[PDB]
Amino acid sequence: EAPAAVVTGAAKRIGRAIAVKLHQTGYRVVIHYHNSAEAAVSLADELNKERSNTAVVCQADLTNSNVLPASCEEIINSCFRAFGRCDVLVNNASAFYPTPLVQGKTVETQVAELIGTNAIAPFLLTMSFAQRQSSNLSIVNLCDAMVDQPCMAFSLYNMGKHALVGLTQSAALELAPYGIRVNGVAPGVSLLPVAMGEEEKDKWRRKVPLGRREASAEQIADAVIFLVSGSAQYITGSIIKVDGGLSLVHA
Amino acid sequence: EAPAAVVTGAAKRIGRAIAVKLHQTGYRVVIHYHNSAEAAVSLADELNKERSNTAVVCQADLTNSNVLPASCEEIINSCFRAFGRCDVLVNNASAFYPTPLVQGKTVETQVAELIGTNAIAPFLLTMSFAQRQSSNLSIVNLCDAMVDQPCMAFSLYNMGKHALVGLTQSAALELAPYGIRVNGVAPGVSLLPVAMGEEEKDKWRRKVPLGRREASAEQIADAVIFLVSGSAQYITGSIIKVDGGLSLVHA
Amino acid sequence: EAPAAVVTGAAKRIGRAIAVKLHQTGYRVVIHYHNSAEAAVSLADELNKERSNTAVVCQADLTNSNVLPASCEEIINSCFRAFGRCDVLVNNASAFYPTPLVQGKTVETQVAELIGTNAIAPFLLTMSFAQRQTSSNLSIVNLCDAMVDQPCMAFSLYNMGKHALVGLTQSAALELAPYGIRVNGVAPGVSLLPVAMGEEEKDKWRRKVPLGRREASAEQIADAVIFLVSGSAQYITGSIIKVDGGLSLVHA
Amino acid sequence: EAPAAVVTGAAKRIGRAIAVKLHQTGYRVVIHYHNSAEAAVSLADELNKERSNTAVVCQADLTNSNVLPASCEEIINSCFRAFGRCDVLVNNASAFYPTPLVGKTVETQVAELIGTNAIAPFLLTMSFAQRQSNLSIVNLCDAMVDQPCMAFSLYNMGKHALVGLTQSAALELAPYGIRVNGVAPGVSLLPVAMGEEEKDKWRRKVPLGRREASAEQIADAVIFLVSGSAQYITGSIIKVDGGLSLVHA
Ligand SMILES: NC(=O)c1ccc[n+]([C@@H]2O[C@H](COP(=O)([O-])OP(=O)(O)OC[C@H]3O[C@@H](n4cnc5c(N)ncnc54)[C@H](OP(=O)(O)O)[C@@H]3O)[C@@H](O)[C@H]2O)c1
Ligand SMILES: NC(=O)c1ccc[n+]([C@@H]2O[C@H](COP(=O)([O-])OP(=O)(O)OC[C@H]3O[C@@H](n4cnc5c(N)ncnc54)[C@H](OP(=O)(O)O)[C@@H]3O)[C@@H](O)[C@H]2O)c1
Ligand SMILES: NC(=O)c1ccc[n+]([C@@H]2O[C@H](COP(=O)([O-])OP(=O)(O)OC[C@H]3O[C@@H](n4cnc5c(N)ncnc54)[C@H](OP(=O)(O)O)[C@@H]3O)[C@@H](O)[C@H]2O)c1
Ligand SMILES: NC(=O)c1ccc[n+]([C@@H]2O[C@H](COP(=O)([O-])OP(=O)(O)OC[C@H]3O[C@@H](n4cnc5c(N)ncnc54)[C@H](OP(=O)(O)O)[C@@H]3O)[C@@H](O)[C@H]2O)c1
Ligand SMILES: Nc1nc(N2CCCC2)c2c(C#Cc3ccccc3)c[nH]c2n1
Ligand SMILES: Nc1nc(N2CCCC2)c2c(C#Cc3ccccc3)c[nH]c2n1
Ligand SMILES: Nc1nc(N2CCCC2)c2c(C#Cc3ccccc3)c[nH]c2n1
Ligand SMILES: Nc1nc(N2CCCC2)c2c(C#Cc3ccccc3)c[nH]c2n1
């Protein structure tokens, strides 16, 4: 019987690249989404076309609130409901926008979305994953290679990703006696929005040592797939940068 | 005019030592506290006896909630209303208890307290402090030298301290243009409670390379004093471990 | 035509596992060795029995000296001599013994062996590798140490050597990225405890590891190397992958 | 009796400022130097004019070689010879120049860059410990060690090694009451002779004040680490960089 994976924020971009890759490697997948309903269902469609009854979608807001623990438990429950098991959890969903310290979402909303999606939801999904448990159980957290050279005025976002590093380590340590490995993948710049000005994209592209290009979504997913594989059976609490050397470039 | 400082969680233990040492150095102080009202008032009394009109108290819960931004604004305000200025903020208050991943406060309450006290309140206090501004302005965040080798079952506490590192770096970068430095002090083991077990204290003491003892509250306060001083005027985004070598000791 | 890899200290243990997997993946290999001459020659024999003239041996002391630069150049040269190309370099060879700060090799000899093997020879091999250079996939993997920030008591020069190696991994990734050469590390925690260590002692270390209360196999370390040299790691450079079972996360 | 400090590479620039500050604090000082004899003697003279018999010079090359351990032992020995004790060691001496991967031989590059930045600090540390009250060592590291300058691999390997020495020695010497810490400068005291356009280019990158560190600012952190206010601090490295290491590309 095939193992099952939950991928948060999997309707598009990096998260969809990860979902697809697990599916192709033989996983059944829960495609989680928040707002992108049409993209999520469309992907579950493709993948079920490929193999019937191997994908489902699951809608959840991962903003922090008093019901977030229930929402995270229901995401995990939804994998068991659909597949009878849950082998892999990939915490990919993330809010990203500036929250300047000195001067519109209220600050309470900004805290809730940025810390919720990047850190607390990952923690709650990890609790639920562990609680509901031959096997290769693992969690992969999507981190950020630039957390120590942060974007100006992204304090909440940066605190959220730092918290996620802390979760990755704490969960690796705690869940090792249950056979559950917990690792991260830390993109540098990846998948630049089409919208973004072509000269702005080139400005950033030119900073990357390896090929003066951003990472493809495929390249990020490749590192996730490694960490979930039997090729990584002794790896836990590791975070693999996938950044083309960007984090090494001084100002 | 003497400079003024806010110290969170200043009624007892390390926060109290930081408040005393700053007051000794010539600062006027706001003693924030949550439950330790008699100790906070007694400290204020003792400090005002040394020097009239140099200490006030401010009570607030720093748990994450819809009212935390106003509470943090209140705390900074208390310093302006008493003293007419606010030069230094020390983010010392901190909830600390285990939050095991595998199963009595609800989990969402555990999240609110541990992430609120250790990260979100320090972010909101930082915003409020910055917004209100040859001065020597700075922020010192009490971090944790053991954050990369965390205690088992302390996930949320560790996440909170990692976020606080993230805040330290982000805010150092963003507030540098205003002349506000942001730094950290990372204690190892300091001031073990009297009522904790003798076997367990001996166990931990014996692990510290430098002297086989915990730090005194005054030794932690010494590093805070340095960072706020004119001897640290080029230092921002730095985190000083005060751990007797404990973090260097392998398992 | 098949790519080619140099693996230093490849006669035994982890280096041997790395050479074997690389060869199994389709690489031709230079098995570098220092003292383990029989092991190196019998390994090359086993590999060539599988595929003809896909393995050669190359002996060199990698202690720091006046002759180390030429030795390192000759290791890379031997790969070009045998196989016409050199696509991968794995810096695995390493001296490891204590050098207490406070009180019969002299200290200058300990410096030369520990800093030479762990840091200087990798630098020189990296220079020679790069100097000699869209289906190209060139890369270097340096064998680091997951416990570098919580070092063994009395192992200052070894630990200095491994820190220098992290520095090289970063500096060389930055500098060689324009040439298409990636530079990464694999950082074991405890792996393949020596056969002659008593099991009761092996178990004292084993017991510290969160993930299974055992040490890594040589093949588990090799698996990380294989990943880093693969096409699945094409945007990965300057990265160090811990393969430590969570050991570095465990407090005193 | 006043305590005594050894400061390597102390004839000029940042090492000189550290010596000056330790001397102002009440230390007797060994000013080690390699080539800057005139500056070193002039400094010793000035410090002894301020307080008699409180400074000496000591000449040594700290390039790696088979005699480096004896040279390091002799530096520590020179502090005991002059002052009867040795309380503080500051490993400041450092070679710094590019060594690209693609007149000096590479053997010589390795010897100077790895010797000065790492092996000499290790040997000096051994000699300091062996010869033994608030005893401590401060190693001058580099806040940019993880975002290094292009083509500076050996320099960078040296400073990484020095971080490892700081940790290993803090761990090992702690039972002897000897603390070991680091100060990691960002851009500091730019050469007067360096091009103004280039200086301005690097200055404008620094978040805190858009200026380099003064040598006195670096020294202030050294002074803290050797003081009685840092008696529980060992194995720590304090960046003194105005936030420069926080700035992405
Ligand atoms: N792109 C980069 O350059 C880069 C750099 C560093 C790190 N990373 C990391 O890699 C991961 C993926 O990057 P990306 O660019 O693909 O991400 P993205 O496009 O910014 O967002 C990924 C998904 O997160 C989900 N999400 C956002 N807010 C949410 C909420 N409140 N509740 C639930 N889900 C929410 C969204 O789902 P819906 O669309 O369904 O609403 C969105 O599709 C992230 O964790 C990111 O931080 C990316
Ligand atoms: N002690 C150590 O070994 C150690 C080690 C590493 C880091 N640290 C850090 O150093 C700092 C001082 O340590 P400590 O041992 O002195 O801390 P502590 O005694 O655990 O707590 C300090 C104060 O935090 C305040 N606090 C707790 N929950 C709060 C809430 N919901 N709202 C507002 N305030 C709250 C409390 O004030 P009230 O008493 O008034 O209720 C408490 O007295 C902390 O940031 C800690 O995390 C300490
Ligand atoms: N084993 C572990 O737990 C562990 C932990 C952390 C990191 N690592 C790293 O992983 C790598 C492999 O570990 P290992 O335990 O397999 O290594 P090892 O058995 O200690 O030695 C590897 C090889 O290094 C070669 N070597 C030693 N001194 C040399 C010299 N002076 N010149 C040239 N070559 C020399 C030896 O070759 P000959 O036998 O031919 O003389 C030896 O076979 C090393 O880089 C190590 O530091 C290992
Ligand atoms: N300046 C910066 O921006 C910066 C940045 C990061 C770190 N740092 C660190 O801070 C420390 C001081 O920096 P700096 O700019 O003052 O240093 P510097 O001017 O480059 O050199 C300091 C001294 O090192 C001594 N030295 C060099 N090679 C030597 C050798 N082979 N043997 C013995 N001594 C040798 C020289 O002595 P003589 O003059 O007597 O020959 C020189 O005066 C260094 O450790 C440096 O790495 C500085
Ligand atoms: N969830 C999430 N989304 C991100 N982005 C979504 C819009 C483009 C970037 C980033 C992102 C970025 C970026 C970026 C950096 C330089 C130039 C353009 C984009 C970093 N972490 C992120 N996390
Ligand atoms: N707010 C807060 N409080 C802490 N403590 C309050 C009770 C003593 C420890 C710690 C603490 C600790 C500890 C400790 C660790 C090992 C042995 C004994 C105490 C670490 N971070 C903390 N943060
Ligand atoms: N070249 C080299 N060799 C190592 N070893 C070779 C013999 C066993 C370990 C180690 C090693 C180790 C170890 C070890 C630690 C605890 C228990 C047993 C082995 C760490 N880095 C190493 N580098
Ligand atoms: N021993 C030593 N000396 C350095 N320098 C001596 C004169 C120029 C800088 C540096 C140095 C530098 C620099 C610098 C950075 C930006 C612009 C100009 C110089 C970094 N590490 C150093 N170590």
Coordinates of C-alpha atoms in Angstrom, one line a residue, chain C:
Chain C
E1 CA 31.0 8.9 -21.5
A2 CA 31.1 8.4 -17.7
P3 CA 32.0 11.1 -15.2
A4 CA 35.0 10.8 -12.9
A5 CA 35.4 11.4 -9.1
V6 CA 38.4 11.7 -6.7
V7 CA 37.7 10.4 -3.2
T8 CA 40.4 11.0 -0.6
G9 CA 41.0 8.5 2.2
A10 CA 38.9 6.1 0.2
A11 CA 40.5 2.7 1.2
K12 CA 38.4 2.0 4.3
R13 CA 35.3 3.0 6.3
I14 CA 33.3 6.1 5.1
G15 CA 35.6 7.0 2.2
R16 CA 35.3 3.5 0.9
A17 CA 31.5 3.6 1.1
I18 CA 31.5 6.9 -0.8
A19 CA 33.8 5.6 -3.5
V20 CA 31.7 2.4 -3.9
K21 CA 28.4 4.3 -4.2
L22 CA 29.8 6.8 -6.6
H23 CA 31.1 3.9 -8.7
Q24 CA 27.7 2.1 -8.5
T25 CA 26.0 5.3 -9.7
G26 CA 28.3 5.2 -12.9
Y27 CA 31.4 7.2 -11.9
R28 CA 35.0 6.2 -12.4
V29 CA 37.0 6.7 -9.3
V30 CA 40.4 7.6 -8.0
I31 CA 40.9 5.9 -4.7
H32 CA 43.3 8.0 -2.8
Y33 CA 45.0 6.5 0.3
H34 CA 47.9 7.1 2.6
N35 CA 48.9 3.9 4.7
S36 CA 46.0 1.5 3.7
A37 CA 47.7 0.2 0.6
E38 CA 46.3 -3.3 0.6
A39 CA 42.8 -2.1 1.2
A40 CA 43.0 0.5 -1.5
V41 CA 44.4 -1.9 -4.1
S42 CA 41.9 -4.6 -3.3
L43 CA 39.1 -2.0 -3.6
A44 CA 40.2 -0.8 -7.0
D45 CA 40.5 -4.5 -8.0
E46 CA 36.8 -5.2 -6.9
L47 CA 35.6 -2.1 -8.8
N48 CA 37.5 -2.9 -12.0
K49 CA 36.2 -6.5 -11.8
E50 CA 32.7 -4.9 -12.2
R51 CA 33.7 -2.4 -14.9
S52 CA 37.0 -2.5 -16.7
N53 CA 39.5 0.3 -15.9
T54 CA 36.9 2.4 -13.9
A55 CA 39.2 2.6 -10.8
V56 CA 42.7 3.7 -10.1
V57 CA 44.6 4.2 -6.8
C58 CA 46.7 7.2 -5.8
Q59 CA 48.9 7.3 -2.6
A60 CA 49.7 10.6 -1.0
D61 CA 50.4 11.9 2.5
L62 CA 48.2 15.0 2.9
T63 CA 50.1 16.4 5.9
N64 CA 51.0 20.1 5.4
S65 CA 54.4 20.6 4.0
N66 CA 56.4 22.2 1.3
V67 CA 55.5 19.4 -1.1
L68 CA 51.7 19.3 -0.4
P69 CA 50.7 21.6 -3.3
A70 CA 52.5 19.4 -5.8
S71 CA 51.0 16.2 -4.2
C72 CA 47.5 17.6 -4.5
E73 CA 48.1 18.6 -8.1
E74 CA 49.2 15.0 -8.8
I75 CA 46.1 13.6 -7.2
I76 CA 43.9 15.6 -9.6
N77 CA 46.3 14.9 -12.5
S78 CA 46.0 11.1 -11.8
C79 CA 42.2 11.5 -12.4
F80 CA 42.8 13.2 -15.7
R81 CA 45.5 10.6 -16.6
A82 CA 43.1 7.7 -16.0
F83 CA 39.8 9.1 -17.1
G84 CA 40.3 12.2 -19.1
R85 CA 38.2 14.4 -16.8
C86 CA 37.5 15.1 -13.1
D87 CA 33.8 16.0 -12.3
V88 CA 33.6 15.4 -8.5
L89 CA 36.1 15.8 -5.6
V90 CA 35.2 14.4 -2.2
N91 CA 37.5 15.6 0.6
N92 CA 37.2 12.8 3.1
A93 CA 40.8 12.0 4.4
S94 CA 41.3 13.2 7.9
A95 CA 43.6 12.9 10.9
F96 CA 41.9 12.7 14.2
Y97 CA 43.5 12.6 17.6
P98 CA 43.7 14.7 20.7
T99 CA 46.1 17.7 21.2
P100 CA 45.7 18.8 24.8
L101 CA 46.4 22.5 25.4
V102 CA 47.8 21.7 28.9
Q103 CA 50.3 19.0 30.1
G104 CA 55.5 11.3 20.9
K105 CA 54.7 13.7 18.0
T106 CA 55.8 17.3 18.3
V107 CA 53.2 19.9 18.3
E108 CA 54.4 21.3 14.9
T109 CA 53.7 17.7 13.5
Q110 CA 50.2 17.6 15.0
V111 CA 49.6 21.0 13.4
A112 CA 50.8 19.8 10.0
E113 CA 48.7 16.5 10.1
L114 CA 45.5 17.9 11.6
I115 CA 45.4 21.2 9.7
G116 CA 46.9 19.7 6.6
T117 CA 44.5 16.8 6.2
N118 CA 41.3 18.6 7.4
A119 CA 41.8 22.0 5.8
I120 CA 45.0 22.7 3.8
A121 CA 44.9 19.7 1.4
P122 CA 41.2 20.3 0.7
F123 CA 42.1 23.9 -0.3
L124 CA 45.0 22.7 -2.5
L125 CA 42.8 19.9 -4.1
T126 CA 40.1 22.5 -4.6
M127 CA 42.6 24.8 -6.4
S128 CA 43.9 22.1 -8.6
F129 CA 40.4 20.8 -9.4
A130 CA 39.2 24.2 -10.4
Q131 CA 42.3 25.1 -12.4
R132 CA 41.9 21.9 -14.5
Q133 CA 38.3 22.7 -15.6
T134 CA 24.8 21.5 -20.7
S135 CA 25.3 18.0 -19.2
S136 CA 28.1 19.2 -17.0
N137 CA 27.7 18.8 -13.2
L138 CA 31.0 19.6 -11.4
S139 CA 31.1 19.7 -7.6
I140 CA 33.1 19.3 -4.5
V141 CA 31.8 17.7 -1.2
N142 CA 33.8 18.2 2.0
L143 CA 33.4 15.9 4.9
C144 CA 32.8 18.2 7.9
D145 CA 31.6 17.4 11.5
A146 CA 28.2 18.0 13.0
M147 CA 29.7 18.4 16.5
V148 CA 32.0 21.3 15.5
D149 CA 30.3 23.8 17.9
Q150 CA 30.3 21.2 20.8
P151 CA 33.8 19.8 20.3
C152 CA 35.4 16.9 22.0
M153 CA 37.6 17.9 25.0
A154 CA 41.3 18.3 24.1
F155 CA 40.7 18.2 20.3
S156 CA 41.5 21.9 19.5
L157 CA 43.6 21.4 16.4
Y158 CA 41.2 18.8 14.9
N159 CA 38.3 21.2 15.6
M160 CA 40.2 24.1 14.1
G161 CA 40.8 22.0 11.0
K162 CA 37.1 21.2 10.6
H163 CA 36.1 24.8 11.2
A164 CA 38.6 25.9 8.5
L165 CA 37.0 23.4 6.2
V166 CA 33.5 25.0 6.7
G167 CA 35.2 28.3 5.8
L168 CA 36.6 26.7 2.7
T169 CA 33.3 25.2 1.7
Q170 CA 31.7 28.7 1.9
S171 CA 34.5 30.6 0.3
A172 CA 35.0 28.2 -2.5
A173 CA 31.2 27.9 -3.2
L174 CA 31.2 31.7 -3.7
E175 CA 34.3 31.9 -5.8
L176 CA 33.7 28.8 -8.0
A177 CA 30.0 29.4 -8.6
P178 CA 30.8 31.3 -11.8
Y179 CA 32.6 28.2 -13.2
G180 CA 29.6 26.0 -12.5
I181 CA 31.3 24.2 -9.7
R182 CA 29.2 23.6 -6.6
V183 CA 30.8 23.1 -3.2
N184 CA 29.0 21.6 -0.3
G185 CA 29.6 19.5 2.9
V186 CA 28.3 16.5 4.7
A187 CA 28.6 16.6 8.5
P188 CA 28.5 13.3 10.3
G189 CA 27.9 13.0 14.0
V190 CA 29.0 9.6 15.1
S191 CA 29.5 7.1 12.3
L192 CA 31.0 3.6 12.1
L193 CA 32.6 3.4 15.5
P194 CA 35.8 1.5 15.2
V195 CA 35.5 -2.3 15.2
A196 CA 37.9 -2.5 18.2
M197 CA 36.0 -0.1 20.5
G198 CA 34.2 -2.3 23.1
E199 CA 30.4 -2.6 22.4
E200 CA 29.7 -1.3 26.0
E201 CA 31.5 1.9 25.1
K202 CA 29.9 2.1 21.6
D203 CA 26.6 1.8 23.4
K204 CA 27.4 4.8 25.6
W205 CA 27.7 7.0 22.5
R206 CA 24.9 5.2 20.7
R207 CA 22.6 6.0 23.6
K208 CA 23.0 9.7 23.1
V209 CA 21.7 9.7 19.5
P210 CA 18.0 10.6 19.4
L211 CA 17.3 8.8 16.1
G212 CA 17.6 5.1 17.0
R213 CA 20.3 5.2 19.7
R214 CA 22.9 4.1 17.2
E215 CA 25.7 5.5 15.0
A216 CA 25.4 6.2 11.3
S217 CA 26.4 3.6 8.8
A218 CA 29.1 4.5 6.3
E219 CA 26.4 4.1 3.6
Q220 CA 24.1 6.6 5.2
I221 CA 26.9 9.2 5.1
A222 CA 27.6 8.2 1.5
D223 CA 23.9 8.7 0.6
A224 CA 24.2 12.4 1.4
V225 CA 27.3 12.7 -0.7
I226 CA 25.5 11.0 -3.7
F227 CA 22.6 13.5 -3.3
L228 CA 24.9 16.5 -3.3
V229 CA 26.7 15.4 -6.4
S230 CA 23.4 14.5 -8.2
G231 CA 21.3 16.5 -10.7
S232 CA 18.8 16.8 -7.8
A233 CA 21.2 19.2 -6.1
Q234 CA 21.9 21.5 -9.0
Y235 CA 21.1 24.8 -7.2
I236 CA 22.7 23.7 -3.9
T237 CA 26.0 25.3 -3.1
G238 CA 27.7 26.4 0.2
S239 CA 25.4 24.0 2.1
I240 CA 26.4 21.6 4.8
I241 CA 24.1 18.7 5.4
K242 CA 24.2 17.2 8.9
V243 CA 23.8 13.4 9.0
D244 CA 23.8 13.0 12.7
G245 CA 20.6 11.4 13.9
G246 CA 19.9 14.6 15.9
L247 CA 23.1 14.2 18.0
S248 CA 24.1 17.8 17.7
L249 CA 20.8 18.9 19.2
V250 CA 21.3 17.1 22.5
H251 CA 22.4 19.3 25.4
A252 CA 25.0 18.3 28.0

